[PDB]
């Protein structure tokens, strides 16, 4: 079995969430470009090292297990009880790879949609900008994912639940900044949608990975434009300013 990291929303604290995200980042990844860890190169990565599993539980003591691809930290599918569900693969190699996940489940399904936000938002009937994140949302998403396996969850609710999980797990692993946003929500017992600073970072993760690894001794060939909390645009010209912001990058050749 692939490595498993457990998290529960029941009695969750800033510390327990912090420990969780640190453990996830630890199973995902020392190999650093300009001070920032790089995820493993897909080329040369054996299939038995391709995925990690995140098992989420809630107050209702329901559990689901998400499968993340270590090459990009992103969710590819999940297991609930005797069933597993996978986003539609982009290519034949990826489709073959996911056959290695959850091999003992009785029922396997592939969705007719991929796991990218632009599509998930359409299916959810809401933009990320209007979907609350926090411990409450995560608790509800876990129940929704679980009940999708028994018929009790409609597609829009499922898609919304994926959007919640991906941001609170994958994007938090990718960015200390987003991890900090989730910690703040936990600390003050709040639920709220991500602001433009978060959305733009999420959207820019691939571009930042490329800019950082292609940089000239840390300096960007061309500036990357991000947004502040209030939506105003600013430019980043250097890797150094991003060190406290981005935790992991996709490997670039």
């Amino acid at each position, epitope marked *: 079995q692939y490595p498993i990291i457990n998290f529960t929303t029941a009695g969750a604290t800033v510390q327990s969430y912090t420990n969780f995200i640190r453990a996830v980042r630890g199973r995902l990844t020392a190999d650093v470009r300009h001070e920032i860890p790089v995820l493993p190169n897909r080329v040369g990565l054996p299939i038995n090292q391709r995925f990690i599993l995140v098992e989420l539980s809630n107050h209702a003591e329901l559990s689901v297990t998400l499968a993340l691809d270590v090459t990009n930290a992103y969710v590819v599918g999940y297991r609930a*009880g*005797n*069933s597993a569900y996978f986003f539609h693969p982009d290519n034949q190699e990826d489709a073959e790879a996911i056959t290695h996940l959850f091999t003992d489940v*009785q*029922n396997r*399904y*592939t*969705f*007719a*949609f991929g796991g990218n936000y632009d599509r998930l938002e359409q*299916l959810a009937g809401n933009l990320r900008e209007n979907i609350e994140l926090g411990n409450g949302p995560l608790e509800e998403a876990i129940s929704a994912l679980y*009940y*999708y*396996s*028994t*018929g*009790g969850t*409609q*597609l829009p609710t*499922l*898609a919304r639940s994926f959007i919640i999980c991906i941001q609170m797990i994958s994007e938090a692993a990718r960015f200390q900044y987003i991890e900090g946003e989730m910690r703040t929500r936990i600390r003050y017992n709040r639920r709220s949608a991500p602001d433009p600073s978060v959305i733009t970072l999420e959207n820019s993760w691939g571009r930042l990975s490329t800019a950082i690894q292609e940089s000239n001794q840390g300096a960007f060939a061309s500036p990357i434009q991000l947004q502040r909390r209030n939506g105003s645009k600013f430019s980043v010209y250097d890797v150094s300013i991003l060190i406290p912001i981005i935790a992991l990058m996709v490997y670039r050749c």
Partner: nanobody
Framework: VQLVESGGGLVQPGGSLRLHCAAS????????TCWYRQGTGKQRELVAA???????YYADSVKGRFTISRDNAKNTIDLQMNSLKPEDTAVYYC?????????????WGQGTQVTVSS
């Protein structure tokens, strides 16, 4: 795919009904088949569901009393309703929903009235 419900009616509290839904086409590959209900002046709510794999879901309000069944050869979906209560009064709808597996088609029946009353 057309869905046609039947078997609704009036019962006294404690009575039983069995709702029937006939699909005009194959439901074998349709992920979710469900019963929803809508009371007067309220929003439609999920009552029970069964997947193409045979897993089931029941709303808290009906657990123990209702049983959903599904026949993938005859293309029918049934709801056995026991120990009925006035609170169960509503229009019941059958739903066949691909739910993002294989496609996005979502079929609804026209609904049938259930009334539990003295």
């Amino acid at each position: 795919v057309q869905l046609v419900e039947s078997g609704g009616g009036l019962v006294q509290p404690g009575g039983s009904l069995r709702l029937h839904c006939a699909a005009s086409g194959s439901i074998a590959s349709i992920y979710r088949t469900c019963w929803y209900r809508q009371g007067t002046g309220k929003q439609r709510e999920l009552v029970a569901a069964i997947t193409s794999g045979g897993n089931t879901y029941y709303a808290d309000s009906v657990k123990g009393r209702f049983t959903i069944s599904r026949d993938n050869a005859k293309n029918t979906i049934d709801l056995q309703m026991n120990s009925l209560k006035p609170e169960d009064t509503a229009v019941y709808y059958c739903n066949a929903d691909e739910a993002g597996i294989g496609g996005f088609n979502d079929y609804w029946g026209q609904g049938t009235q259930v009334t539990v009353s003295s």
